[PDB]
Amino acid sequence: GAAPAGGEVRRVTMYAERLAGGQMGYGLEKGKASIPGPLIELNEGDTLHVEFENTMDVPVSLHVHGLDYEISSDGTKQNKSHVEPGGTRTYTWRTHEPGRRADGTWRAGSAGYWHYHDHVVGTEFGTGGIRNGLYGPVIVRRKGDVLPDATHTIVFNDMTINNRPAHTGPNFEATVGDRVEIVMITHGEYYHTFHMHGHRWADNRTGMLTGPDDPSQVIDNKICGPADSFGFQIIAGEGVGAGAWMYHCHVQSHSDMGMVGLFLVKKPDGTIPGYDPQEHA
Amino acid sequence: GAAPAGGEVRRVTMYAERLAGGQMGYGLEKGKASIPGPLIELNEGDTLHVEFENTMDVPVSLHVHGLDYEISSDGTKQNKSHVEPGGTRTYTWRTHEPGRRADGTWRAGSAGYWHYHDHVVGTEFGTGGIRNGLYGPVIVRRKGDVLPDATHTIVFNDMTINNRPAHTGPNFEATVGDRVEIVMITHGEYYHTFHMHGHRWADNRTGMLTGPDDPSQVIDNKICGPADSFGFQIIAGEGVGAGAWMYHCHVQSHSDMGMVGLFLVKKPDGTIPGYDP
Amino acid sequence: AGAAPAGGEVRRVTMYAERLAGGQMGYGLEKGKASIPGPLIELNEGDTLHVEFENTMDVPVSLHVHGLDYEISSDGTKQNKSHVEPGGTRTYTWRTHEPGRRADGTWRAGSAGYWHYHDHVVGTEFGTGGIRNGLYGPVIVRRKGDVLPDATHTIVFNDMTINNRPAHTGPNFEATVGDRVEIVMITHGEYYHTFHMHGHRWADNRTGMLTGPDDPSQVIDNKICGPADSFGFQIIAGEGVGAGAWMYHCHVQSHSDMGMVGLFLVKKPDGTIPGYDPQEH
Ligand SMILES: [O-][O-]
Ligand SMILES: [Cu+2]
Ligand SMILES: [Cu+2]
Ligand SMILES: [Cu+2]
Ligand SMILES: [Cu+2]
Ligand SMILES: [Cu+2]
Ligand SMILES: [Cu+2]
Ligand SMILES: [Cu+2]
Ligand SMILES: [Cu+2]
Ligand SMILES: [Cu+2]
Ligand SMILES: [Cu+2]
Ligand SMILES: [Cu+2]
Ligand SMILES: [Cu+2]
């Protein structure tokens, strides 16, 4: 697979729901909200109309990074694009291809790893919403972008991964050789440094080197702060083989307190070498 | 609207002065000091002799990032290039173009988004003088760089933008279609994440991709730490139209405590849709 | 002087973990010669390194590496039972690969870059104790044709110290104007830092050096960094600025104020640094 040229006009329904544990989630269907919210994938040029409904007892909003949107889809109290309790609103996101402007410069596409989150709960910056779990990924693909066997979203939200209690992963499974895509988002108050054992990627738009003349740095550790978003694709177990490969924040008290999960890379027979589930507790 | 080749020897007078309620700033003429300090632009290859005068009762200095300067223009007490009270000094900053060295490798030029600040007030690293307002931006352009319709300078200085009180901006104005340049400098103790609503830029030298071969990440949110500086040009309203477009620090307590302003992009008739002055 | 050659050799080294004075711990290649930072390990892409490792201490220790290819048995984590018991021995194997075109048409990133190793088991199962105590070291993987330097120096921001040195005690590095000097910068611990050098700059890419006039990497003199970040650059000492006691420091204001400063002592050909008086520093 490779992404095709874009330009489809899409629609979807989206709800903001209270979840258990005092949380809040987005979902595509009533009663199916998740944390992180649902992954929205677009190709450059597609438009997405989001038929949005607020099912909670407090205003909420939908603010997106990186995608074209007019002020009316800003998703803020400050230009009256929030959604009252029980209210509804259609947010529109647009994307565009890159190309030469008439002044000679190059307009950058919308392609990239982006995200969306609340901007209204708690404060007019969505501090309460984001803490509760109102966030999710948006991938915009360029025509020709290689496509992954799977996509996993890792959000460092304050001292949590995906709002989970400490040392509860999440874990992610792949088989040696799968092309795995990772979307990494950070939210909240703290900086973090995302690290993956056994695996590395290029610090560019795709996480993959364009070819032999890409000078981007190849890393396995990146500092990130609130609302940063990047992603990459790795071949699971490439050059290293199967195993329970940790990913964690490398800030030493963060990993000690539980900002750790496993990238479980399995042999073809589905087993994991030297993976004693209880030696990782 | 493109930068020319440099090589001109330029001179400017700068002054350090005190300002109201504890603050201090640089000025091009006395009485006229500002926080941030004056924007300095140069073309790669230019030399700049800053004829500097400290009008304050305490020592001060002028230290610059990225530009060429000999150790005597270090702007540090450590190297004895600070400026005593009432004193004067001439700091020389030079720039160069990119080109191939003798050893055959490529030497990077001076072009970039840079800044200058005090290095001796409060501490030997400027801690009290940076806190007080003693910082400013420097742009060095390469030959061929497209020139903006405006440049606006945003300094995250601890928990403030441009040492301004919380929730007071600043706001900048443009018209849809304007090529707008933002200079972003961070100072103090805190990390930040700069975010702009409705607009995006490439994470490279200019903030614009070189072309279809430029693999630089395109972003709208950037982590920055003390003495980081970067800049970019955007077409205002490009693909998103007019309106009051927020920029802020995206650390949640920071934006909550007031690290937020507006990029007011106006329709050619001058009105901003949706905006509530 | 010159270029990195093509890799492919299988190298062996003995490495030791040893107690050092002051409650510190260090790696070394020979007994009694442990250092903080540990020894610089240098490989070319394709090289294999069998580290014959010995733990001379009374507590468990491990060797974990960033960026290189290792199988999960050389993870160096208690979690995967690749730590070394007090008095114990273990051969860690690190591999590197050249970049190249995969059968799927994408470009495989090579191992080349500025990497580091460190402990993963001392104090906590994320090595928080052994990293505090000085168990960390640089690794450089060179791509064929990489420019070699006249000298390489390693600067590790470890918590609020540089190379575990007392406040304001450097270290200092000396070069002559025109020397090609390689800096390897690693960060560790709990804190974010910004690395700054007076009178010098580099490219934010793999080598630190612009590949040519087509390379768009930002050129910087100041770089935010977090725990386990590792980058490097080569500069021409004093190029366009002359001899001098050029400070490098973390630019987080209170960090420099309280010790995170050192000196790049760049000398004229006659050995002099005019104006340099250590008592003013
Ligand atoms: O506000 O993101
Ligand atoms: Cu916002
Ligand atoms: Cu963290
Ligand atoms: Cu690791
Ligand atoms: Cu945001
Ligand atoms: Cu901030
Ligand atoms: Cu936003
Ligand atoms: Cu500075
Ligand atoms: Cu680890
Ligand atoms: Cu620091
Ligand atoms: Cu400096
Ligand atoms: Cu300095
Ligand atoms: Cu590590």
Side-chain angles (χ1 to χ4, degrees), chain B residues 134-158:
Chain B
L134 288 160
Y135 53 74
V138 193
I139 302 176
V140 185
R141 315 222 182 255
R142 183 155 293 150
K143 165 164 61 134
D145 282 4
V146 189
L147 295 160
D149 295 300
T151 296
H152 304 282
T153 288
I154 302 183
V155 185
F156 288 173
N157 186 28
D158 285 319

Side-chain angles (χ1 to χ4, degrees), chain B residues 63-65 115 117 119 130 187 227, chain C residues 196 198 222 249 251 253:
Chain B
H63 164 69
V64 79
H65 282 243
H115 60 105
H117 61 95
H119 213 297
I130 289 159
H187 276 302
Chain C
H196 175 46
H198 290 225
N222 194 98
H249 51 112
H251 208 309
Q253 286 302 130

Side-chain angles (χ1 to χ4, degrees), chain A residues 63 65 115 117 187 227, chain B residues 195 250:
Chain A
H63 169 77
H65 279 238
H115 61 98
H117 64 85
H187 265 304
Chain B
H195 177 54
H250 213 307

Side-chain angles (χ1 to χ4, degrees), chain B residues 63-65 69 74-76 78 117-119 124-126 227, chain C residues 196-198 222 247-251 253 256 261:
Chain B
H63 164 69
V64 79
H65 282 243
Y69 54 95
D74 200 26
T76 66
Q78 288 87 336
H117 61 95
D118 164 60
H119 213 297
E124 289 183 56
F125 291 95
Chain C
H196 175 46
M197 297 195 69
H198 290 225
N222 194 98
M247 309 167 86
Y248 73 86
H249 51 112
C250 174
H251 208 309
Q253 286 302 130
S256 49
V261 202

